[PDB]
Amino acid sequence: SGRLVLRPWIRELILGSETPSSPRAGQLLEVLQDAEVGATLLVSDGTHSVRCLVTREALDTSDWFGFRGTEGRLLLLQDCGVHVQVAEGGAPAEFYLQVDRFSLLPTEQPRLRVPGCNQDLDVQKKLYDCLEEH
Amino acid sequence: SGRLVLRPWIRELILGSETPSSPRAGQLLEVLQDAEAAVAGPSHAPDTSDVGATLLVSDGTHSVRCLVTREALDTSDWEEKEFGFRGTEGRLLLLQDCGVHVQVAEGGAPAEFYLQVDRFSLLPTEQPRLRVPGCNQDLDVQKKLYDCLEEH
Secondary structure (H helix, E strand, O other): OOOOEOOOOHHHHHHOOOOOOOOEEEEEEEEEEOOOOOEEEEEEOOOOEEEEEEOHHHHHOOOOOOOOOOOOEEEEEEEEEEEEEOOOOOOOOEEEEEEEEEEEEEEEOOOOOOOEHHHOHHHHHHHHHHHHHO | OOOOEOOOOHHHHHHOOOOOOOOEEEEEEEEEEOOOOOOOOOOOOOOOOOOOEEEEEEOOOOEEEEEEOHHHHHOOOOOOOOOOOOOOOOEEEEEEEEEEEEEOOEOOEOOEEEEEEEEEEEEEEEOOOOOOOEHHHOHHHHHHHHHHHOOO
């Protein structure tokens, strides 16, 4: 017997050129900005983390209020899009996810630290390819 | 930096006194019966778009037969996804809408609990497939199965 695991997907979603059709599952690490604009979440795939912007569109077309309290729960991102926040205060630009539809999963688990996906060299190369063509 | 795990849920679901209000992730172990897509217009080719697909799904602890409904199959997006399931064994399957049903003995096979899936999604994650006992081989499940049977 054993347990089923989720495999990383964030880095692949960013390096890919196509928009994610199928959904992605990851763990909710932190609620940066909860819902009352959408909400800002820190999501992990076990290997990397990414800030996800859950649009208002997604908050309305959802079952269910507020994400705080579900930290550690798995999260289904049904509608994703990789975007680029541009450099502002000293900090460079970063990739992030805009989520237009999501769904909470039952599995709850301890939260483990993970590096940000923008710290990955392949991701970084691609970022500095978007900025030098935008 | 760690492994994200999925919580076993099949035995707890069947024994619980209610239906899965929320989605559940599992792994496709085997394809007992794949499903063909519906083709408009007559043909001398056998049509089976009435039958849905039948999968053996694991949750890491137990396995359970899943009947992926026709509705579920046609309300799905098959972009860069050959309509079907063979080839996806080892992939994570998310049952977004389902329920526990009883199957009375028939055709040589004894009564058992199984899941009807009216909506699913395929996750990218692929993983090794570990031998796992069927949930119906569980003592408490069997006791409930017979309890259910004694109500027809």
